[PDB]
Amino acid sequence: WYLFQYGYIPVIHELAEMEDANAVEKAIALQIPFFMLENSDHEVLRTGEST
Amino acid sequence: GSGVGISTGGWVGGSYFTDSYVITKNTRQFLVKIQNDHKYRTENIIPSNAGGKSQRCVSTPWSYFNFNQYSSHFSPQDWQRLTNEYKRFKPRKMHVKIYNLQIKQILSNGADTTYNNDLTAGVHIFCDGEHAYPNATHPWDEDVMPELPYETWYLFQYGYIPVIHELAEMEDANAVEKAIALQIPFFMLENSDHEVLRTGESTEFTFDFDCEWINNERAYIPPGLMFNPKVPTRRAQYIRQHGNTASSNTRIQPYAKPTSWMTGPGLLSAQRVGPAGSDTASWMVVVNPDGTAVNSGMAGVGSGFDPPSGSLRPTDLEYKIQWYQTPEGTNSDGNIISNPPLSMLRDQALYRGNQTTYNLCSDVWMFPNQIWDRYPITRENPIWCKKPRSDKNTIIDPFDGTLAMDHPPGTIFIKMAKIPVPSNNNADSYLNIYCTGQVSCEIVWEVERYATKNWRPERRHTALGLGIGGEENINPTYHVDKNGKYIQPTTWDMCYPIKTNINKVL
Amino acid sequence: GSGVGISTGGWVGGSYFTDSYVITKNTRQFLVKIQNDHKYRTENIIPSNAGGKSQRCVSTPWSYFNFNQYSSHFSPQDWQRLTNEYKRFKPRKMHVKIYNLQIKQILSNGADTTYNNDLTAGVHIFCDGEHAYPNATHPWDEDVMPELPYETWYLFQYGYIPVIHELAEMEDANAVEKAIALQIPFFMLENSDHEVLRTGESTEFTFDFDCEWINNERAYIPPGLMFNPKVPTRRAQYIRQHGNTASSNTRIQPYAKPTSWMTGPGLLSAQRVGPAGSDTASWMVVVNPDGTAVNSGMAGVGSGFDPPSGSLRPTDLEYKIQWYQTPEGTNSDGNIISNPPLSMLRDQALYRGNQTTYNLCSDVWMFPNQIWDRYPITRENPIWCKKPRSDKNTIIDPFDGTLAMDHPPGTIFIKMAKIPVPSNNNADSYLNIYCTGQVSCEIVWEVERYATKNWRPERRHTALGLGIGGEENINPTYHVDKNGKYIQPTTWDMCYPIKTNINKVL
Known part of the structure; x- marks a missing residue:
């Protein structure tokens, strides 16, 4: 079983393309969330550990 | 102890925030005056330009307190703190006191008028907790407790619609029109047991809420x-x-x-109709059972349904919720027009492939696997609405953002005790009196704080979004000018709506 | 149990907010490499264009952890929530763990290099809690723990300045120059008892703070x-x-x-001097006791003092604090320039009546009945500074906004154990190794929530103040672009300073 890389869609792209000047396009873009999984407490294992 | 020269309470005010709950305390000064000549009347409201729309009302002597509004309970400071710091809130408990009552006699000689108190006079206070009477309050009406705690609250007269008028007009001979008319109910509030207070007495009322949460989180x-x-x-x-x-x-x-997953429901097909004096709605809900002649247009028979759009994108300004921020607002001056919160659940559309392009389908009916958000609510929205009692209903989400309740807070009715005076020939001559007093409303709000794993900053409501107005145009919004007038928000964002700041992971 | 194939800890991360306190948890991956050829050296740092400024440093084999920064402990989300919801905070307790260490040998054949672990190798970890050694860390340096939790933290070599160089240059014959030189202290970290770890061992360190609050409230x-x-x-x-x-x-x-009441102190008279390579400051603090020849300009003898302004309004950009947001920032590109918070205690001036007009007096010395605010601090500010030990001092408020401490968090020093190899002719040939491991920092922060009687809304930090940049210029601030590069705030307001949002009644 080969793992697949994790990824997510943060914003609808066409809304935030912010071509030229648009006030609401600018606002949607500044609100784009960003998630790192390192902010969580998780576990690190070596070859003798299991979970 | 207690007596004429002893106060029955004191002023409460402010807001107390905790992580679990919020308590808002509000006191107002109110005025009760004699309404409707101490008598019940049933009058026809028939304006000239309404295009056939006419109603009959039963006007009473009674007046009532209306607490349904956010601006009344929360200050702009308290509201900002609520929508910034909490992802959920719902009303939990509500306690109302009426106290420090003053009944005075109005002696009108002429241009001059004098005011003398009468200690033996009294005031009737009835609270309807079982909803045995027609509901006094309706969302978006102007009768609510004032926003500024130092402003005086003038009661509004109680009245109700006993029958659809056009059905019971019973012009010429009709069998079903005659039958509908003979069944018209008539409600007096004196059939109830209520309380009479003098100037040293006070009263209290408690109310519990069975509610659904208001959700302040946003979908990105x-x-x-x-x-x-x-x-x-x-x-x-x-x-x-x-x-x-x-x-x-x-x-x-x-x-x-x-x-x-699927787009939430909404109806975009219809357009509003006719002169403004008429009832104008894109969609019109009528009850016209059988029998009764069609007579005028459907405007007279029907009620009318807006906002029709629900979660769908309003095509134009006909479909958007808009109101006036002050009672003096007229003709697109001082009107606030709702805007998209920029939540992805809130605005939605469906398109239909014809094999070439996509075409917007206007009527989205309710369908399985639909998701949407309730309307984002500001301070200027009403809190709750009365859910009509019936056998069957669909999912309940009023498009005005209110919380529908089986038993909302019971309306408190209040009336000046009729003091008759003698008369040589028999007429109704009441003594002319009015009562002013203090009413305090304490609502306990259940809240929940947010925790997010988002890295980036999130939107918040800032005073930097507010505008500046006044006579000299130097004062900011939610402040007072040099005439004492209170600067109202010009735009919908200055009202600090919910479903904006706090992100959620769907 | 414990062993080679057992991990000695796990990743901790995040932030936990309560009304009483906040806990920030951070873990990083760090890299230790052999520094300075395992030897202490004392070198002269003498740049060509510095205009006579020259120093001598003692370079060591050791490296150190530097936790002093806000960006390292708080995320932009956590910082926003802190400065919006709390009027006070101070660091309380700090717990550091070093664990999951991996020592590897570097086999350099050529263009290719291979890496093999050696389980018997070890690493020295020394924490100085009594401050018996020259302080390793200084505010505003670039050596701090990374902001992004997935970025690798490269240790920086430890070194200290043993003597003012120009005094001890001892050119020709001077009696006092000779005396200052013979007194030059020399510090080795091996005189201390410290710990040696192998790949299965871990260490922990606790630190308590005796501090003054950071105050987030604003004066209107x-x-x-x-x-x-x-x-x-x-x-x-x-x-x-x-x-x-x-x-x-x-x-x-x-x-x-x-x-x-009176304006806080500050010195506006002086201007910066000379070429940029030189130490350039409007005010220069020198120690030149007696004896030693003047030689070059005062730049060599002195340290230099900025920001000089304190609470006074900076006349120009020379007096304003500015830094670079990335180490690649050069020449007014990527520099953030401090701005007024619009607090009325923060910016101040004195004018002197001549009987005709008022004239700004540049030097405001410390005077009775003065009030001011500390510098408003962002995430990009250092948290604390070392308060030098001395007999006498005036009021302590570093103009960089840091908290001066008698005993800041003790510096943790770390070094690769020297592994000697045999040699036919006697030379120093060490085995070439390096260690990577995981360090977690947990700070407990004491906080206090605000309660205000203000009616109106207050300013808050919003993501709507952020900018948009990147390669494609589509990504917002505090996000990553398509190359993995992290978009940095362009302006000082995007850094969310304190002493802005929350009002106080003086």
Whole structure:
């Protein structure tokens, strides 16, 4: 079983393309969330550990 | 102890925030005056330009307190702190006191008028907790407790609509018109047991809420957009032959993954009709059972339904909720027009492939696997509405954002005790009196704080979004000018709506 | 149990907010490499264009952890929530773990290099809690823990300045130059008892803070402006005769009431000097006891003091604090320049009446009845500084906003154990190794929530103040672009400073 890389869609792209000047396009873009999984407490294992 | 020269309470005010709950305390000075000549009347309201719309009302001597509004309970400071710091809130408990009452006699000689108190006079206070009477309050009306705690609250006269008027007009001879009319109910509030107070007495009322939460969190993507764009999909799609382009069967693209979820319902087809004096709505809900002649247009029979759009994008300003911030507001001056919160659940649309392009389908009825958000509510929205008692109903989400309740807070009715005076020839001559007093409303609000794993900053409500107005145009919004007038928000964002600041992961 | 194939800890991360306290958890991956050829050296740092400024450093084999920064402990989400919801915070307890260590050997054949672990190798970890050694860390340096939790943290080599160099240059014959030189201290970290770890061992360190609060509240008026403008005053004023205008004695106006309070101190007189390569500061603090020849300009003898302004309004950009947001920032590109918070305690000035107009007096020394605010601090500021041990000092408020401490968090020093290899002719040939591991820092922060009686909304930090940049210029601030690069705030407001949002009544 080969793992697949994790990824997510943060914003609808066409809304935030912010071509030229648009006030609401600018606002949607500044609100784009960003998630790192390192902010969580998780576990690190070596070859003798299991979970 | 207690007596004439002893106060029955004191002023409460402010707001107390904790992580679990919020308590808002509000006191107002109110004025009760004699309404409707101490008598019940049933009058026809028939304006000239309404295009056939006419109603009959039963006007009473009674007046009532209306607490349904956010601006009344929360200050702009308290509201900001609520919508910034909490992802959920609902009203829990509500306690009302009426105290420090003063009944005075009005002696009108002429241009001059004098005011003398009468200690033996009294005031009737009735609270209807079982909802045995027609509901006094309706959302968006102007009768609510004032926003500024030092402003005086003038009661509004109680009245109700006993029958659809056009049905019971009973012009010429009709059998069903006659039958509907003989069944018209008539409600007096004196059939109830209520309380009479003098100037040293006070009263208290408690109310519990059975409610659904108001949700302050925002959706950053549509529910149909949640997938990993990298991972390929097993699904295949078939494109029928159209033009010279031959048919094809192929695997769906990894970025194109189809959603299992659907647009919330709403009706965009209709347009408003006729003169403004008439009832003007794109959609008109009528009750016209049988029998009774059609007579005028459906405006007289019907009620009318807006906002029709629900979660769908309003095409134009006819479909958007808008109100006036002050009772003096007229003709597109001082009106606040709702805007999109920029939540992805809040605005939605459906398009229908014709094999060439997509076309917006206007009527989205209720359908399985639909998701949407309730209307984002500001301080200027009413809190709750009365849910009509019936056998069957669909999902209940009033499009005005209110919380429908089986038993909202019971209306408190209040009336000046009629003091008759003798008369040589028999007439109704009451003594002319009025009462002013203090009413305090304490609501306990259940709240929940947010915790997010988002890295980036989130939107918040800032005083930097506010505007500046006044006579000298130097004062900011939610402040007072040099005449004492209170600067009202000009735009919908200055009202600090919910479903904006706090993100959620769908 | 414990062993080679067992991990000694796990990743901790995040932030936990309560009304009483906040806990920030951070874990990083760090890299230790052999520094300075395992030897102490004392070198002269003498750049060509510095205009006589030259220093001598003692370089060591050791490296150290530097936790002093806000960006390292708080995310932009956590920082926003802190500065919006709390009026006070201070660091309370700090716990550091070093674990999951991996020592590897570097086999350099050529263009290719291979890496093999050696389980018997070890790493020295020394924490100095008594501050018996020259402090490793200095505010605003680039060596701090990374902001992004997935970025690798490269240790920086430890070194210290043993003597002012120009004093001890001891050119020709001087008696006091000879004496200063013979007293030069020399510190080795091996005189201490410290710990040696192998790949299965871990270590822990606790630190307590004795601190003063950081205050997040804002002042809406100056302290001299607090009075009732209506009430008249008893005070009289005397205006000496000037021109044809005769003298007068008169009562002070009710709106003009004089303050009993004074502008905070600051020095605006001086200007920066000379080429950028030199140490350039408006004010230069020198120690030149006696004896030693003047030689070059004072730049070599002195340290230099900025920001000089303190609470006073910076006249120009020379007096403003500015830094670079990335180490690649050069030449007014990527530099953030401090701005006024619009707090009335923060910016101040004094003017001196000459009988005609007022003139700004540049040097405001410390004077009784002065009030000011500390510098408003962002995430990009260091948290604390080392307070030098001395007999006497004045009020301690570093103009960089840091918290001066008698005993800051002790520096943790770390070094690769020297593994010697045999040699036929006697030379120093060490085995070439390096260690990577995981360090977790947990700080407990004591906080206090605000309660205000203000009616109106207050300013908050919003993501709507952020900018948009990147390669494609589509990504917002505090996000990553398509190359993995992290978008940095362009302006000082995007850094969310304190002393802005929350009002206080002076």
